[PDB]
Amino acid sequence: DFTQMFYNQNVKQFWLPEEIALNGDLLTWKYLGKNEQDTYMKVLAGLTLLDTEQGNTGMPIVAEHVDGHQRKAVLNFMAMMENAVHAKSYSNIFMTLAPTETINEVFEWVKQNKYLQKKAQMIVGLYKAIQKDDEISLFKAMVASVYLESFLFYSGFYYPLYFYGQGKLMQSGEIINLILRDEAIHGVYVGLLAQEIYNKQTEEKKAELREFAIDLLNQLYENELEYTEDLYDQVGLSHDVKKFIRYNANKALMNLGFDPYFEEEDINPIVLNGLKATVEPLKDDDFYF
């Protein structure tokens, strides 16, 4: 009942980072403190890693196991967006704002950062555990994918949105909003596929799947807290970001058909502010008036 409308929405949202000129951010970037620039680079690098694996591994593997040519076409399109559009856009931002050495250093930093490695290990592990014709392993990977789309990106998204909302780094911010618009529909779509599998189960099996989903969310959440503190303490924003990731965790659960898990909190209003022609032939009567 939904794939065709997601197909149409995904293809109509198609974009490339080169559509957005980035040289306009040069001055507001220059004006940020060293702490702010450091957090910003690292945040986008963490996002790049997530999209790299979502494009290389997550979306293609889910596409392989989901039945139906139209469902596969949507998932293939989403996979392309992850690595050919999203992951690449971050390099466009980096290449504009930062010198090569700072770019090299931040990519080295992703390799050695323990929270980023842990979250990649956990998510990719679940993708690679999918067994052919085994719907339960597939469900588990789809939960992981929804958590990546609708929860894990958000510790990263906070900062570009926080600046966009203050009228700073608005070209980079425009790119990020386009990425976010895509991930929102990706999270909903994968969520609907996960619910399909969940709804086939006995009540006993469902109870176990909810346990899996909640245990996984809590494990990812605890790691994300440490990651958030590590990045944001130097810019004074860790508590604010934590509220934002809890907000988005609830959205991820909802995408999976589950009740919200965290209590509602006031999000920084700055971040909330951060959010051919048809052809007819000529008739002989069109030449006379």
Partner: peptide
């Protein structure tokens, strides 16, 4: 954006007329 190339051609031909 709703009007097609037929409408554009009609405007051009009426301008010529």
């Amino acid at each position: 954006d709703t009007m097609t190339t037929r409408d554009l051609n009609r405007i051009d031909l009426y301008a010529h007329h």
